[PDB]
Design a protein around this nucleic acid. Sequence first.
RNA 1: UUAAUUGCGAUAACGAACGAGACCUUAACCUACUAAAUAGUGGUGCUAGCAUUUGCUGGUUAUCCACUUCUUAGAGGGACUAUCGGUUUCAAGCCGAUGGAAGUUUGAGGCAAUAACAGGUCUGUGAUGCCCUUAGACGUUCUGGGCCGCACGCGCGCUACACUGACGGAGCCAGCGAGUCUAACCUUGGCCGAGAGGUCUUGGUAAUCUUGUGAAACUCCGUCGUGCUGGGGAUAGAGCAUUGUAAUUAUUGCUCUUCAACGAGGAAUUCCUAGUAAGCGCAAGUCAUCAGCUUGCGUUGAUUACGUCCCUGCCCUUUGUACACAC
Lengths: 141, 100, 143, 63, 167, 103, 82, 145, 53
Amino acid sequence: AVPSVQTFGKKKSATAVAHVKAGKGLIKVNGSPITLVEPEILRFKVYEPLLLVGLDKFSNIDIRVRVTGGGHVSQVYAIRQAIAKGLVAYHQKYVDEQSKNELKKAFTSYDRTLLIADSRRPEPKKFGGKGARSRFQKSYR
Amino acid sequence: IKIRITLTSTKVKQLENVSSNIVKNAEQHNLVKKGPVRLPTKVLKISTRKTPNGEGSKTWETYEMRIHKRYIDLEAPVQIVKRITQITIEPGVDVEVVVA
Amino acid sequence: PGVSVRDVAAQDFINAYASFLQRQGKLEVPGYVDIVKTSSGNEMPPQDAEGWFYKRAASVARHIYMRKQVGVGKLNKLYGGAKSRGVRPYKHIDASGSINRKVLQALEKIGIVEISPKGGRRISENGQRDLDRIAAQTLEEDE
Amino acid sequence: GRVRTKTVKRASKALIERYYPKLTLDFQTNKRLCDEIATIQSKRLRNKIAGYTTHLMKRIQKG
Amino acid sequence: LISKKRKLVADGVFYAELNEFFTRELAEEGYSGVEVRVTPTKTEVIIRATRTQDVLGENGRRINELTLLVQKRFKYAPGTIVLYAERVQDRGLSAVAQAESMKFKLLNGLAIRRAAYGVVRYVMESGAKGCEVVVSGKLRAARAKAMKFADGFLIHSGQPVNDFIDT
Amino acid sequence: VLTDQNPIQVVVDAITNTGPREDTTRVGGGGAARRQAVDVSPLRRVNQAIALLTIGAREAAFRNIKTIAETLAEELINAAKGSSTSYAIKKKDELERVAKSNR
Amino acid sequence: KKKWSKKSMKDRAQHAVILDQEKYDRILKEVPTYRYVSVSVLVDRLKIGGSLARIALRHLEKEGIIKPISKHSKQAIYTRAT
Amino acid sequence: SLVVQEQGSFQHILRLLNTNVDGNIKIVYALTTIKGVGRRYSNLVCKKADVDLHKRAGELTQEELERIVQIMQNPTHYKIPAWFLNRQNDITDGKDYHTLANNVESKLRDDLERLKKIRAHRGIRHFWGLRVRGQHTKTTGRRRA
Amino acid sequence: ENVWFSHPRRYGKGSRQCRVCSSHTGLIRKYGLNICRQCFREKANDIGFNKFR
RNA sequence: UUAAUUGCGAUAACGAACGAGACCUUAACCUACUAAAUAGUGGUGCUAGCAUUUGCUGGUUAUCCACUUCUUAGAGGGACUAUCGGUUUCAAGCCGAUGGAAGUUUGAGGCAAUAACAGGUCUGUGAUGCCCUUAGACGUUCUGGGCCGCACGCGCGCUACACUGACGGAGCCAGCGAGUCUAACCUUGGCCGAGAGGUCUUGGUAAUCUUGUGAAACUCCGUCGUGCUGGGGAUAGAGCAUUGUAAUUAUUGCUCUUCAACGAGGAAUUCCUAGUAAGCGCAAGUCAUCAGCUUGCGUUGAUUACGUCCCUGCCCUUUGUACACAC
């Protein structure tokens, strides 16, 4: 049985399911490499976990991310969370627990949202206004 | 033969108990099956102005009727399938049977 | 391990494939091009008049590759856009059904796409081979 | 805010009054014993009762 | 061959229809509520009433009339829908029955206050935790007033009103 | 590309040079509302500086061939060096002048 | 009624859309010693049109005196090479 | 990267279809100033005349000008799809024209006078200066003077 | 008479009406109950529609 | 002190009830249980491409097995401000820090006292009392119009005045929800057409089909260049089509043409404290046809506060009153 783990990354509506396996050190999303998410800025945003933790930690890991839902920004954030949490789960399953702890400590030091899904859920719209809080307009005369 | 019983109720408690007794009855009858697949609840929502006339602040209210749908696929002789249908009836839970 | 339009960027590959198709010129352009606006939502025809059909063809071929099967309605929805309906709010509008359908027909004739069961057009084996070849050419030339 | 109301305060006071030796200064075990020692019509209400009972035990343990 | 949503909505509208028909026809018979059970080729409608014999009729003539009326109105095959009259348990603990009784008394001509107090006392002695009666309209006057006669205690907010309160 | 020092350094230098230190608040007085000079806030200094730079960039980019990016860069350069020709520094010194006057 | 203004003269620039030799030699000799080069810089330092400035930028980058930094559209940044 | 000499050949102002057209601008968007032709028609006319669209209006040849105006005057003879035209199946003869600067005004006045003479509701509204396409005149259109 | 009701009533408010009060205003076609809103706000509880939000 | 007649307490009051809270739905967490050819996961049976080193990227339900990470739902668990530090008649509490999915009663709703208003509604009701009409009727129905008319004033809004942009091409993304029976809905795909639309059937009474609703704003390249300009698209002319028995005082869409004010708006005034404002579009409602309107939904996601009673009000106490149809 090949060592393999299954994780996810979430956002407002974006779900990025990640399969992480012992491979030759590659990252791919929807069959595309991590270098072709093509916002040219959120691209470095999703580079952030790999660069922060060092590429030596992806020596023999292949990551496959399947992404569904939410706009482009939410999808990218879900991708980055999914790959970070997948690497953390792989190191928790097979690598030293001390190494996993320092890995996730560096992750959380750089950004809390690489491992913890956001809690900002949309506020439902209520009648009498176009949004959650905004009302229409109060006219007297 | 792969028959399928679909339960299309609104009362989640009665639907759950009918599903539980049906699956345990097939368990005691030694029937091959899958578990009760629970499709997403379908809400039937109507947004209506509270006032019957047009006066007052524009307040609304949304009435939601929740429909809970389950289905279990069984493989059993027709006599036992009919017996299954004719046992464990809870009013309000509507049950229908198809094949494949 | 292997080349693919998946591992090649989008705009540059579609431009390269469009250039290849235009340079060959065996695609049976319908001849009513240089007239239409490619949609009822667009207010102008494409800016590069002598081409833009090879660009649409490259986009459609790559889209078919990336997916399994798409049809004329799918292409209309995809290439549609927000239409400026005067003082009315914008809204999504489909593309030119005839343009998308005829680019499908041309790709069918050249064998890049094939009519798949359950409707729609799937990628063909020769289309797979060709598009992978352009991806390999792109990565061997640029790098 | 966090100002517990009369129902929870009074029920916790009664629980402390008649169950001081059995229940302790730990919220978790206080709640896991309250659930079985007194019926509550709500899990959230029982958690509130257990939290205030733990607070009262802490207050009692000194003075 | 109808959709599940339309099937459930049609069942609800059907229930509302028979409830209104029974509450308008069987008013003097103490009708309080109904329940419909679905059985293959058999829909059984249970009429909860206080005057069960009167809603049954003489030798079943009135129950037959009701069954045939429902059959032909809802276009069922004759014999598919069967009507069973059941004497309602705890007539006091039924707001519909008590309101029907109060309406009947006011139609007779009993005093508003006396009838309301009798209703309240009966409801409370029947095992109710609380009773409230509001009479609104022109009561020996020209300007409408609303009198409230209550005993015990009721509630207004939450889920406990949504279940424990019968209006 | 211009002023080849650290872009982050010139940005923060513009921020700290543009933070308005003396401001004014409305006071009732009685009869005619007047104005009272008030010092003090570093968080408001930072906030007002950022808003001033951004607003001046928006104005100088509005209805102009100059792009918003380059006009923001020019404003930040001007503020960091200290020139009184940038919108943000101009408004800063105006605010301090009126505060000193009503002082 | 009233046009919500004063109806006075504006700046009324005279940017040239087409250049001649007296412009070609000038641009070719003056695009050096420019710390920052942009389409807007060319327009406001030469009094020419935006399309002409973009053509000048592309031709100058083709020959090569200025080096590019960012290839993004709607904002072109260039620096002279010394 | 061609450089054109500002000679009399490159004229900043030209006369075309009895109206003045500016140079210094794109050829199609200078054709657009001809009353009766818009951006679509100007682009199509330039494409069928084979003059480069990105070329400026100041630098054209006499043959380019005359060919362009010929295409405007006689669209259907040059493989125009015949639904591009603004006078489709005329009430007078029934064939298809596309008008020029003077004939757009001529035909507009002619059909306005036709409606006014036959006393149609649309013509009567045009005569009164009111809205004809059935808008709400209660609140808008106040600046009619 | 062949003109007493000759006008078509195949769509709109002439055809559609409330199934409890014969009202042409406030109808609810959604899910095919054909009950006007005013009466539905009364009968919704026993139909099955309940308020939760 | 709290959001709170919320509590700690004081105490001619003690004991209670309603309202608040509790409660009930909805949104957050579960690699814990039950699971699932109407949802997604792995070697391959078969077959595709670069590539055969020993990989990478796809398609196939009756060709296999195993799983619910993700999807769905049921049963639950979880958070009660948990643990520390500071403060307080050293109480109720509050303020910080660490964990935690979640620490402004977790966010948002539903429900919601007494007592009233001569507020709205007899044009929702076969819900109604009194008055009026009741046969060339104020009943009902048929044919036409009107509710849309236009000097003018007002309110809710949609589009803008622009290169943080317009246009053209290229990319790829949601969530809410609806859908055909004594009658034809949502409609894939092939074909025709520039377009709007038109033709044939399998698809779906529905997590199986529309529908991954491939939405839009948005990102990548180009064209435009501070010019009411390729900004804006009002007002009009010609034609095509669709819905309807019927469109004319244009239903609506489409094609071409026409290319108006508007260069950011006075006094005044509205809404809003985080996924909120704002931008963007989508779905449902009325819908034969008609959204620039509502009810929700999701996408991108600022500034500024963590206060005060200054204006507008509100609650409590004290106080004065010649007020009580109550300033």
